[PDB]
A paper describes a structure:
The breakthrough X-ray structure of a fungal TMEM16 homologue, nhTMEM167, revealed that TMEM16 proteins are homo-dimers. Each subunit is composed of 10 transmembrane (TM) segments, with structured termini on the cytoplasmic side and featuring a polar cavity (groove) that faces the lipid membrane and serves as the permeation pathway. TM6 and TM7 also participate in the formation of the two regulatory Ca2+ binding sites located within the membrane. Our results illuminate the detailed molecular mechanism by which the lipid groove of the nhTMEM16 scramblase can rearrange from a membrane-exposed conformation to an intermediate state that is occluded from the membrane, forming an ion-conductive conformation.
Hydrophobic interactions between TM4 and TM3 that keep the groove open are strengthened by I343 and L347 in TM4, and L302 in TM3. To relate the mechanistic hypothesis to structural determinants, we used single particle cryo-EM to determine the structure of the L302A mutant reconstituted in lipid nanodiscs in the presence of 0.5 mM Ca2+, to a resolution of 4.0 Å. The predicted disruption of the interaction between TM3 and TM4 is validated by the observed increases in distance between A302 on TM3 and I343/L347 on TM4 from 3.7 to 7.4 Å and from 5.0 to 7.2 Å. This causes the repositioning of TM3, which slides upwards and away from TM5 and TM6, and of TM4, which tilts away from TM3 and TM5 and toward TM6, bringing T333 and V337 of TM4 to interact with Y439, T443, and V447 from TM6. With a minimum inner diameter > 2.9 Å, this pore is compatible with the movement of permeant monovalent cations such as Na+ or K+ while sterically precluding passage of large cations, such as NMDG+, which are not conducted by nhTMEM1624. Thus, the L302A mutant loses most of its lipid scrambling activity while maintaining significant channel function.
Author numbering:
A (entry chain A), B (entry chain B): 16 to 97, 101 to 128, 141 to 267, 276 to 319, 324 to 403, 427 to 468, 478 to 584, 594 to 652, ...
The structure:
């Protein structure tokens, strides 16, 4: 039970240069209290001063709610519009309570010591929520709407990308179990059910997204963009950066990908040649070490390159934040692409079909159905042990490593422990959950019992991430978006690529020489077939109008209906009898002489 | 100079059943004059009664203009909104003058003798317009906007699809002349310039369309649909037809296409075998007759099948008129597809590559560069002679075939000659102008001097159609639409198909056997390349925002801006000085003991 605290600002004051710190502290307190929010000061841990803020006069906040609530009517966020009477008719949920206060602390008014503004956690909510998700098997729609209020939309959107990827993994699980029991291995009919399913999930998601963004009322938030504060500009007109200076910096991404093809490629050369060096030249030390080299070497080489990619993203300047996450993810996607697939491509397209010709520079049948075992059993239980147990143990032994006070002796002892954690972001979870999908879309026909093991690691990741957010990471500052950023696009590229490599595989590792002809014809057939079932499920799933969408078109019409119903509410042979007389006259005149 | 007449209704009364005709005539006159428009009666020609209507009280018409002008604000046709004051601020153009009167004559109120309602022509406008288009080479944007006012939007839209297809034919003309002079015949570099150009024209058109539909203010008219009056319905809910009865009728289209593959295919078997029958077994009668068999046999076999296709479209019932032209065109497209290409496919994919194997059931090099000469010189000058000269001669000799009267002796003699003509539709012109594009998109690399002859038959068709509308067809009843109906889609299919067949051709009629390998690899490369340059010109031509579009986003904002600016216009350590005092105290308290 927090003491009504809405935010906590850190304001670290070090030993050196501490004389520009007290005046800057007064500059912080005055600028905070002119906005209209109270302040308190406690101790930190070593040299810091945890400043506590909350809103004080509820009328200024209730008008502040209105000052953006009828800002959302302006830019076409929602259609409807409600004199400070937005509290009883439709209340303020805990998204809009904590976002607008965060919009009052950082503002364009129309600081090199503040470490990190961060909200607090309510632990009376956590032991209900993490328990009640673990006694259910499925999850209802109304339980995701109980995670929107307390965390935001962009944290609540990832849990709806998981739930609607759960229940579409049950199709190629069961029809993947059949192709492990009934049909033989590497068969073509699995390579089109996995070809068909990777459009039905991808297109039923893009229709469920614009429905579920209507019901929350945040449909058009991607149209508005706001300025990132670290933007630079030479001369204003709205500000502008010289765009030809961005071409000189964006081109350095090509020596990043050129470093990416050689770095993650260097590990598989270490993996392949150490496999032979321990084979020919401790017998049980030979079969346990190339596993333990690949689980401790890979997330270090993916750490130093992504940290180099995060540095390249800040040097390449960007204007808007929506164009900032559209370039961090692409420079991070190619990095995690060549790390979690170039151990698998080189086995299936070079090692197993060309195992005769590469030999003077035999072939064993136990590698492609064994390396796919790696990325499905032992590279997930080393991941679930790392994503939860390692930070929980690292923070528990660190708690023992230490060397008005009525209830504040414990309330400071909760919030001081918070600020040494990391801010949880749903960028990394989407990057994993979009990389894991690949295996069951490109390299799945090489071992058709891959879906039925991924469906048990998404009934735990649906509650592992619910555990990680509340025991090992401070609450994310709530944001709003409509779709899953740029992830949806690079989800499409993991569909077409999955439908090509898969077709080539259903032909090589199965005509006597199996090369040139059947291979190219099979890939062309499986590619053209994809580009035809990407239209029919763009045609069946486009004549089905959603219920939500009705709530937009009616209220657009009904408001437009109500708006104008509260504001308005020569040859002259004249004589209509004269005209019909000659009409009955002329038609008999034409028929009394013929 | 017409006498203010806005429409002419025919009302043909025959010999038999003429007793239900005078009472029905009075039923016509009364229902016309209760709407509020005057009536006059003249003679017809043989048994008819040309009824003349015009609007009488300009206040009822000026409110009728408003009754749909603020109907267009309701359904989101345009954003802006102007008490019968829509005459001086923005006047009524001659589209909206003649459409609304036509919307008063046919109405849902909220007749088996009336032949055809049709507007009249102003011949003081025609001799200016057809002359002034023939003294210019190019055409300015402001001259197409002088054809919108007098004819509509859907007649004025076809002249903007021609003008922006004129000036993009100048690219593969000049770079087609080079591939006839510099480079050799059947070269691959022409097969990608024709591959690139068929996206740049197709994507620059779809961007110029939403611009030019903004400036006319008819942007969203395709969203509204209205009921076709000949619709049937069993039980209402808005009415509804049983949709499973439509599946029983729509399936009969498959025996139409199955009749289409055999009928137009039967003519080329007649073309091929009569060529040999006159070759072996009058020397100048041998080289002139297979031309004269193909120009008089083809538009008869395309007449009886399209008339069968028009009968199938009326039997298959449809609700809305927008779903009526989306099924007449598709059933007419496949008919004109297999007639103007299956004489050309069978030559280029069977005759010239497989000329050895088919021979016992030699090969000559003079057929593919001679049959492409047919569809470019002699099948256009037989078409321009048919589209203009034949109906003008047929109507001139028919004028000699005949067997209050102050100025009405000549004014009846103009309007009586009108009603025996045909109602001009821009469906057929789009069908031709979309079929002719194919030759320069699929079969163009087989004879790279095809564009430079199509660019002189579109400087005449740009004024032949301007001649046909005013000398040989009554004025079309003005309509409104935003895009070129369903033509734009089946324009896209003529792009991908053009990029495949063309790639196969650049490999067959040019490895020694030229088969299986290079062929499939070349088509795959030219198809994948297409699907990559369909993204870059969906990315360069999508970061360029149009000027028109600015006029929508500002006036949406400025109205929304103006609308709300004309209606509105605990731990308590209180004392901001107390808070900053302990703040300067604690940071020294933490640094007077360390
Ligand atoms: Ca995981
Ligand atoms: Ca994870
Ligand atoms: Ca023509
Ligand atoms: Ca024509």
């Amino acid at each position: 039970s927090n003491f009504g605290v809405d935010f906590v600002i850190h304001y670290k004051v070090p030993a050196a240069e501490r004389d520009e710190a007290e005046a800057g502290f007064v500059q912080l307190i005055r600028a905070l209290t002119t906005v209209g929010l109270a302040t308190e000061v406690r101790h930190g841990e070593n040299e810091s001063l945890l400043v506590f803020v909350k809103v004080a006069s509820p009328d200024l906040f209730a008008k502040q709610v209105y000052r953006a609530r009828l800002g959302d009517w302006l830019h076409g966020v929602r259609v409807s519009a409600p004199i400070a009477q937005a509290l009883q008719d439709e209340p303020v949920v805990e998204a809009e309570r904590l976002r607008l206060i965060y919009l009052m602390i950082t503002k364009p008014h129309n600081w090199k010591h503040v470490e990190s503004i961060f909200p607090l956690h309510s632990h009376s909510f956590n032991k209900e929520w993490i328990k009640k998700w673990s006694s259910k098997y499925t999850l209802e729609q109304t339980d995701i709407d109980n995670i929107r209020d307390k965390f935001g939309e962009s944290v609540a959107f990832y849990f709806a990308f998981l739930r609607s990827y759960f229940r579409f993994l049950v199709i190629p699980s069961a029809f993947g179990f059949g192709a492990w029991l009934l049909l033989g291995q590497f068969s073509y009919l699995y390579a089109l059910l996995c070809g068909l399913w990777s459009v039905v999930f991808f297109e039923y998601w893009k229709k469920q997204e614009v429905d579920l963004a209507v019901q929350w009322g945040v449909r058009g938030v991607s149209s508005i963009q706001q300025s990132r504060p670290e933007f630079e500009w030479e001369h204003e007109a709205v500000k502008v950066y010289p765009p030809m200076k961005r071409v000189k910096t964006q081109l350095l991404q090509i020596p990043f990908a050129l470093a990416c093809v050689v770095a993650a490629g260097a590990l598989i050369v270490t993996c392949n040649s150490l496999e032979v060096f321990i084979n020919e030249v401790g017998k049980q030390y030979l079969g346990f070490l190339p596993t333990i080299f690949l689980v401790i070497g890979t997330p270090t080489i993916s750490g130093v390159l992504m940290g180099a990619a995060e540095k390249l993203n800040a040097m390449e300047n960007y204007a808007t934040v929506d164009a900032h996450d559209a370039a961090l993810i692409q420079k991070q996607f190619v990095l995690n692409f060549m790390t979690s697939y170039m151990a698998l491509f080189f086995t299936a397209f070079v090692y197993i079909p060309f195992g005769h010709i590469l030999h003077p520079f035999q072939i064993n049948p136990a590698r492609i159905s064994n390396q796919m075992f790696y990325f499905t059993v032992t590279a997930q239980i080393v991941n679930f042990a790392t994503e939860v147990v390692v930070p929980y143990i690292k923070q528990q032994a660190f708690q023992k490593a230490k060397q008005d006070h009525e209830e504040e002796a414990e309330f400071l002892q909760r919030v001081r422990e918070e600020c040494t954690l990391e801010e949880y972001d749903v960028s990394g979870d989407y990057r994993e959950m979009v990389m894991q999908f690949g295996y069951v879309a490109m390299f799945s026909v090489a071992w058709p019992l891959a879906a039925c093991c991924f469906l048990v690691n998404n009934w735990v990741e649906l509650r592992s991430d619910a555990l990680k957010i509340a025991i090992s990471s401070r609450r994310p500052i709530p944001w709003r978006t409509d779709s899953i950023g740029p992830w949806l696009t690079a989800l499409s590229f993991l569909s077409w690529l999955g439908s090509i490599t898969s077709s080539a595989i259903v032909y090589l590792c199965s005509a006597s020489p199996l090369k040139a002809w059947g291979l190219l014809l099979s890939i062309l057939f499986a590619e053209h077939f994809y580009l035809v079932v990407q239209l029919a499920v763009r045609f069946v799933l486009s004549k089905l109008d959603s219920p939500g969408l009705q709530k937009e078109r009616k209220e657009r019409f009904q408001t437009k209906k109500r708006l104008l119903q509260e504001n308005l509410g020569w040859q002259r042979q004249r004589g209509m009898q004269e005209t019909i007389e000659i009409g009955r006259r002329m038609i008999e005149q034409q028929l009394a002489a013929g």
